[PDB]
Ligand binder design. Structure first.
Ligand SMILES: *[C@@H]1O[C@H](CO)[C@@H](O[C@@H]2O[C@H](CO)[C@@H](O[C@@H]3O[C@H](CO)[C@@H](O)[C@H](O)[C@H]3NC(C)=O)[C@H](O)[C@H]2NC(C)=O)[C@H](O)[C@H]1NC(C)=O
Ligand SMILES: *[C@@H]1O[C@H](CO)[C@@H](O[C@@H]2O[C@H](CO)[C@@H](O)[C@H](O)[C@H]2NC(C)=O)[C@H](O)[C@H]1NC(C)=O
Ligand SMILES: *[C@@H]1O[C@H](CO)[C@@H](O[C@@H]2O[C@H](CO)[C@@H](O)[C@H](O)[C@H]2NC(C)=O)[C@H](O)[C@H]1NC(C)=O
Ligand SMILES: *[C@@H]1O[C@H](CO)[C@@H](O[C@@H]2O[C@H](CO)[C@@H](O)[C@H](O)[C@H]2NC(C)=O)[C@H](O)[C@H]1NC(C)=O
Ligand SMILES: *[C@@H]1O[C@H](CO)[C@@H](O)[C@H](O)[C@H]1NC(C)=O
Ligand SMILES: [Ca+2]
Length: 964
């Protein structure tokens, strides 16, 4: 029969007592506590003033960005002057311009006016590529010829930029790239490196996001696509491709909507008013455009009366400047003067008309439409012209800002994106270069209304991470930065991968934009904090929050303090996250050389046998010291650097080395004093200790090989979980993996060491014990059953036909069970085993499911969706019958004290046959939030407030029709 409540309570208490006493008397929690207090005077406890740390880091970031901006300013000034001094030569001798071309074979062994350079590249670990500091490299795309009179002249006058490149690199030796995009297509970057290796190069500097950002202002684009009968065939395909390519030239500050009209206008997609050009809204628009079919009779007066009306909707968020209309058609007869005179008579909306396809229609009304209203006229007769014709409109948009003068020259930083030359995540500062030919004397201003190009300097996210040190903080603490759009400049979750836009269809260029709410669990307080950081305010917030574990299988509850201050002079805002225990940290004392030598003796490779297999985190301690992926090489390197020259050396971080050696001494003292006394423990497979300061030691040698955790202590998930929890934490092993299962490695349970210096609280180290599966299962079996209770089993035997005994963790994964096949399935989620039982537990509020979306994830032909189950009711007791289909199974669940395990004893599914749709806990490729519903309630984003959208001097006489 079903055991009584007092009997099962006693049974759970016995199992608890056994496990907790084994863990406490095997891993020396009190032992390390006593060691830490009684080895005082070798360290001091220093405060962590968040208001000071975040301000210092913000000031450092501001200084770095000002350094990066001064180079742009001086480069732009020099380029403007050199263009002002240039003479337009036409007769170029075969050797008059000298450059590298950055795309020629280095060994040709062999032009109209150019002489190539054979440069020398040695190496540079700062870039990873092979670079030359002697001269700059020029990239000319495949389409544009390098012998044209328009390209040779720039190849000549831009040659003066190399001196300023060298001057900037010698003033600030940390400059990565210094690129000068040109209006003709060529790009000049200072460190001479070969271009990226069918290998055809489609790169065009005039389409990169930084160039587009620096060449114009945020736009309000409304593409108007003609879908009448006449555009059927090749014209429709060209229109679709051209619209997609035009959508590709849009940033997050830009708002766009695509409409269509044969005889009555309609929105092409679910959007109705306007959407910002994210990576997802753009995909929605592209798919809706690719679904377009052509049928009907053209009606311009009903399409423009629709475009102008959606350009007047102010209930929604928009860039509120540069209201432009794109007309994609073939040709017609109606110019529709009445519509323009009615809607746009003061001429505040630009109109760009495109004549797509190969035909013989009247290209007359559309040229007049692009002429009367501000705009330019384009013709796309083939796929080749699509790129240039779609990218050219920025030249037209750039006139107001150049006419503004030396007021639009403001440095703007792009979103995080993967570098073209493979440096990883970078951000580029952009400064436009104006045309000042004949500036001193008021003679020429007709062609001075077009930009020469955009200057750009790249700063890597590694620099910004280096400006924010994290090793004085607890692993749970971290830094993050937010831009006005809400995306993260810095975040631990952010990874160098393109953002998943949707489910991968069967059979790097895009910016990496990850929102703050999409990098952590969304919470009500975290939205207010995000809004405050966007507004640019400084404040403190302490609140209870749910934090996802690093392994992403668990959710644990902790106290966190958010401190944020704006990076003044820059749109970005910086914030610091600190748990309560992280407010105080241990700083190692200088001590003496004898102590350093004694501590260095501990972790030598020959000393593994006594100390245990030692892991050292790959943290850079010296500039010459090189971190390695394999921990053995790094440990050998650290040993030889410490022993060979000095424990403390110039150009090395004294604090980090002192902390590491102090931790090594503490760990060796622990092991030799306590662990060595008990050579073998029946319940314990292995004893390991993980300590802040990047050292990990496990006593058994076989366990060291079995140990699969990250060498870095901060990256360990179990370490962070033990920090968050004040009780013993059990970590479920991985199931059906290449790594050894929980039969040779055991079950990992970890308890955090708590230190009380003065009244302060410190949690420097975490200890763990690996539990033998065999000892655990036999102990679980013997205590559960009562020998004289009854003939039929009152509790589970080794293989109970009826009664089922399984103990679960907070995540719900199975750690121990009576059944043999269940024990073969240790480490698996308890779903796929008794899914109806899990659904009942969730329904009665035993576990709480919280789902999220990972956007930077890779699948097999993407956004995935993850689920993470946690305990949510702190009631130690739950019972009930399952009320199964036509039946009912009785269960009782008791949680095992501190250890956090939960034992549930229920009947087998033979008794009451329920349905088994599994409750899966993995990540399943799932498309993310519907964009259509998310645009109705947008998030809060601050927007640039500097727009140059009109000047009255602007000469709109270059409309294009006349010049063709
Ligand atoms: C655009 O191309 C032109 C051709 O290379 C360059 O103009 C030439 O610059 C040369 C620099 O070596 C000048 O040579 C020197 O000029 C001085 C006058 O200061 C004279 O004594 C000599 O002609 C000569 N001597 C020296 C000191 O080497 C050429 O006079 C000059 N003229 C030509 C041939 O066009 C420009 O440099 C280039 N533009 C930019 C901005 O780089
Ligand atoms: C950035 O500079 C601003 C200047 O506006 C600083 O803000 C000032 O802070 C000082 C003392 O902290 C006060 O005397 C001023 O009244 C503040 N001005 C305000 C309210 O804007 C700010 O300290 C700097 N921020 C950083 C990151 O150091
Ligand atoms: C939203 O925009 C629409 C048009 O874009 C406008 O509709 C008005 O709605 C209010 C109340 O909802 C009513 O007075 C009328 O239906 C509309 N006003 C007019 C045309 O007189 C309005 O600008 C916005 N609606 C709201 C919610 O204010
Ligand atoms: C994720 O977990 C949190 C904490 O359990 C959820 O918040 C609770 O939701 C339940 C109902 O699901 C309410 O009864 C509680 O009052 C909520 N607590 C708080 C503090 O709001 C949260 O709703 C879960 N879901 C997601 C996906 O966010
Ligand atoms: C700014 O550059 C100066 C030299 O130009 C340098 O001393 C300083 O460290 C730089 N600031 C940074 C990189 O934060
Ligand atoms: Ca037609």
């Amino acid at each position: 029969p079903f055991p009584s409540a007092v009997t099962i309570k006693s049974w759970v208490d016995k199992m608890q007592e056994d496990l907790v006493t084994l863990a406490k008397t095997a891993s020396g929690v009190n032992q390390l506590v006593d060691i830490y207090e009684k080895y005082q005077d070798l360290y001091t406890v220093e405060p962590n003033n968040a208001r000071q740390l975040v301000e210092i880091a913000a000031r450092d970031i501001e200084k770095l960005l000002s350094n990066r901006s001064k180079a742009l300013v001086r480069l732009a000034l020099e380029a403007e002057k050199v263009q002002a001094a240039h003479q337009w030569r036409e007769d170029f001798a075969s050797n008059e311009v000298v450059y590298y071309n950055a795309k020629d074979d280095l060994d040709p062994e062999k032009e109209p006016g150019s002489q190539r350079i054979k440069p020398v590249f040695i190496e540079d670990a700062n870039f990873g590529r092979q670079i030359s500091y002697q001269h700059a490299a020029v990239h000319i795309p495949t389409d544009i010829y390098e012998g044209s009179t328009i390209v040779l002249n720039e190849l000549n006058w831009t040659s003066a930029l190399d001196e300023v490149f060298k001057k900037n690199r010698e003033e600030d030796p940390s400059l990565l790239w210094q690129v000068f995009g040109s209006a003709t297509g060529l790009a000049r970057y200072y460190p001479a490196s070969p271009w990226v290796d069918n290998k055809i190069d489609l790169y065009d500097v005039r389409r990169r996001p930084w160039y587009i950002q620096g060449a114009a202002s945020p736009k309000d684009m409304l593409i108007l696509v003609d879908v009448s009968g006449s555009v059927s065939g090749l014209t429709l395909k060209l229109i679709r491709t051209s619209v997609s390519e035009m959508l590709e030239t849009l940033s997050d500050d830009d708002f766009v909507n695509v409409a269509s009209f044969n005889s009555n206008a309609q929105d092409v997609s679910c959007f109705q008013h306007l959407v910002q050009a994210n990576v997802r809204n753009k995909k929605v628009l592209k798919d809706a455009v690719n679904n377009i079919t052509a049928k009907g009779i053209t009606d311009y007066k009903k399409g423009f009366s629709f475009a102008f009306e959606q350009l007047l909707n102010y209930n929604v968020s928009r860039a509120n400047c540069n209201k432009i209309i794109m007309l994609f058609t073939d040709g017609g007869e109606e110019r529709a003067q009445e519509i323009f005179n009615k809607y746009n008579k003061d001429k505040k909306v630009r109109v760009f008309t495109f004549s797509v396809g190969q035909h013989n229609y009247d290209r007359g009304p559309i040229q007049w439409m692009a002429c009367e209203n501000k705009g330019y006229y384009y013709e796309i007769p083939s796929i080749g012209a699509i790129r240039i014709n779609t990218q050219e409109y920025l030249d037209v948009l750039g006139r107001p800002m150049v006419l503004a003068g030396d007021k639009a020259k403001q440095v703007q930083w792009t979103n995080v994106y993967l570098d073209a030359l493979e440096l990883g995540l970078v951000i580029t500062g952009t400064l436009p270069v104006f045309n000042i030919t004949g500036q001193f004397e008021n003679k020429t201003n007709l062609k001075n209304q077009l930009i020469l190009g955009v200057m750009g300097v790249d700063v890597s996210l590694e620099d910004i991470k280096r400006l924010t040190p994290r090793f004085t903080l607890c692993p749970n603490g971290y830094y993050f930065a937010i831009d006005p759009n809400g995306y993260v400049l810095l975040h631990p979750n952010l990874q160098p991968k393109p953002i998943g836009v949707g489910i991968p269809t069967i059979n790097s260029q895009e910016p990496v934009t990850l929102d703050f709410l999409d990098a952590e669990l969304e919470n009500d307080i975290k939205v207010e904090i995000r809004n405050k950081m966007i507004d640019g305010e400084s404040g403190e917030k302490t609140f209870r929050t749910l934090v996802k574990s690093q392994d992403e299988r668990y959710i644990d509850k902790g106290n966190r303090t958010y401190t944020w201050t704006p990076v003044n002079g820059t749109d970005y805002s910086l914030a610091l996250v600190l748990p309560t225990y992280s407010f105080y940290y241990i700083k190692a004392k200088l001590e003496e050389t004898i102590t350093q030598a004694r501590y260095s003796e501990t972790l030598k490779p020959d000393n593994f046998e006594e100390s245990g297999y030692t892991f050292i985190a790959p943290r850079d301690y010296c500039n010459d010291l090189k971190i390695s992926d394999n921990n053995t090489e790094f440990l050998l390197n650290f040993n030889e650097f410490i022993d060979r020259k000095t424990p403390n050396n110039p150009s090395c971080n004294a604090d980090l080395i002192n902390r590491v050696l102090l931790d090594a001494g503490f760990t060796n003292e622990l092991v030799q004093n306590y662990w060595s006394k008990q050579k073998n423990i029946k319940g314990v497979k292995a004893r390991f200790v993980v300590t802040d300061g990047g050292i990990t030691r496990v006593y058994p040698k076989e366990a060291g090989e079995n140990w699969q955790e990250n060498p870095e202590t901060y990256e360990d998930s179990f370490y962070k979980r033990s920090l968050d929890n004040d009780n013993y934490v059990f970590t479920a092993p991985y199931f059906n993996k290449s790594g050894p299962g929980a039969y040779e490695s055991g079950i990992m349970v970890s308890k955090a060491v708590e230190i009380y210096i003065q009244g302060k609280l410190l949690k420097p180290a975490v200890v763990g014990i690996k539990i033998d599966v065999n000892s655990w299962i036999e102990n679980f079996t013997k205590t559960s059953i009562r020998d004289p209770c009854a003939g039929p089993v009152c509790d589970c035997k080794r293989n109970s036909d009826v009664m089922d005994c399984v103990i679960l963790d907070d995540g719900g994964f199975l750690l121990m069970a009576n059944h043999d096949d269940y024990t073969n399935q240790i480490g698996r989620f308890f779903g796929e085993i008794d899914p109806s039982l899990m659904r009942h537990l969730v329904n009665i509020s035993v576990y709480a499911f919280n789902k999220s979306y990972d956007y930077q994830s890779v699948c097999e032909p993407c956004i995935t969706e993850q689920t993470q189950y946690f305990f949510d009711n702190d009631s130690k007791s739950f019972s009930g019958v399952l009320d199964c289909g036509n039946c009912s199974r009785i269960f009782h669940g008791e949680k095992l004290m501190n250890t956090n395990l939960i034992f549930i004893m229920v009947e087998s599914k033979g008794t009451c046959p329920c349905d088994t749709r599994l409750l899966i806990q993995a990540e399943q490729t799932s498309d993310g939030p519907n964009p259509c519903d998310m645009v109705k309630q947008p998030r809060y984003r601050k927007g640039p407030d500097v727009c140059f959208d009109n000047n009255v001097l602007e000469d709109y006489t270059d409309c294009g029709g006349v010049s063709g």
